[PDB]
Amino acid sequence: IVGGYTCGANTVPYQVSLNSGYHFCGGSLINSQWVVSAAHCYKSGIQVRLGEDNINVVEGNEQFISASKSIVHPSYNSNTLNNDIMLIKLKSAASLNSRVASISLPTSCASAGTQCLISGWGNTKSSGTSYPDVLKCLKAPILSDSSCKSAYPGQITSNMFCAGYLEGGKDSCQGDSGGPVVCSGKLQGIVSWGSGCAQKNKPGVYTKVCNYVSWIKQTIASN
Numbered sequence: 080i081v082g083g084y085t086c087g088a089n090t091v092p093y094q095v096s097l098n099s100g101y102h103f104c105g106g107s108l109i110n111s112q113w114v115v116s117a118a119h120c121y122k123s124g125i126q127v128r129l130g131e132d133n134i135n136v137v138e139g140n141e142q143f144i145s146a147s148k149s150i151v152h153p154s155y156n157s158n159t160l161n162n163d164i165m166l167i168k169l170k171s172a173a174s175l176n177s178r179v180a181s182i183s184l185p186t187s188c189a190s191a192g193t194q195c196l197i198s199g200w201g202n203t204k205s206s207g208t209s210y211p212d213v214l215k216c217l218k219a220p221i222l223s224d225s226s227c228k229s230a231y232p233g234q235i236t237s238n239m240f241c242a243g244y245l246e247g248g249k250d251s252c253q254g255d256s257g258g259p260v261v262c263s264g265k266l267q268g269i270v271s272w273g274s275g276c277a278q279k280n281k282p283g284v285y286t287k288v289c290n291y292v293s294w295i296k297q298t299i300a301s302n
């Protein structure tokens with residue numbers, strides 16, 4: 080997260096860290112046994128780490144659970160990043176409590192202007208690479224589709240929305256992918272992509288979760 084702030088230990092209880100000997104992506108706990116992330120984060124041998132703050136130190140409250148199966152959206156396109164959503168089933172159910180909780184799926188799409196909270200352990204620098212130990216947060220509004228499409232001509236699908244600041248300096252970045260975009264207590268987006276990080280007129284593009292509610296529910300119900 081570039082231009083964000085230290086969230087505070089366990090203040091984002093639904094935030095998940097996807098680990099394979101190091102943190103490579105974020106995710107959101109949607110129920111005791113299912114995590115939603117980005118399809119481009121797909122990797123075998125994934126360990127889901129819940130209740131994390133400092134990812135390098137064991138401080139207590141952590142829960143390391145292996146993924147039993149990662150279901151990448153069947154229509155995910157790795158070039159366009161369209162349908163960039165993946166469901167991960169936990170080998171065991173997470174122990175939900177004050178520091179490890181699930182986030183609700185939206186019942187309707189969020190409108191432009193809506194302020195959301197984006198979080199993750201991704202790169203904190205626009206020019207260079209600097210990864211934080213603790214979770215970083217960023218509050219950012221959902222942009223209008225006209226502005227979004229103006230920023231990324233021919234790259235925005237109906238399953239994507241822009242959120243961030245056109246002036247640059249504040250945005251999600253590498254390592255944040257798969258992470259949550261929560262608006263009014265609902266998971267509206269998944270950190271997907273962007274041209275660089277915190278660049279002027281190049282906001283972050285996120286997977287529009289409200290377009291996937293039925294798919295998520297149906298897939299979970301059949302798995």
Ligand SMILES: COC(=O)C1CCN(C(=O)[C@H](Cc2cccc(C(=N)N)c2)NS(=O)(=O)c2ccc3ccccc3c2)CC1
Pocket residue numbers: 119157158159160250251252253254255256270271272273274275276277282283284
């Ligand atoms: C297929 O999955 C990948 O290989 C991933 C590589 C990383 N990736 C990116 O968008 C990167 C870094 C990144 C990641 C997440 C959010 C932002 C942001 N600015 N909000 C930037 N930004 S980038 O400018 O280097 C970039 C942008 C668009 C891309 C589209 C397809 C493939 C790689 C891409 C890389 C997403 C796709």
Ligand SMILES: [Ca+2]
Pocket residue numbers: 131132133134135136137138139141
């Ligand atoms: Ca830790």
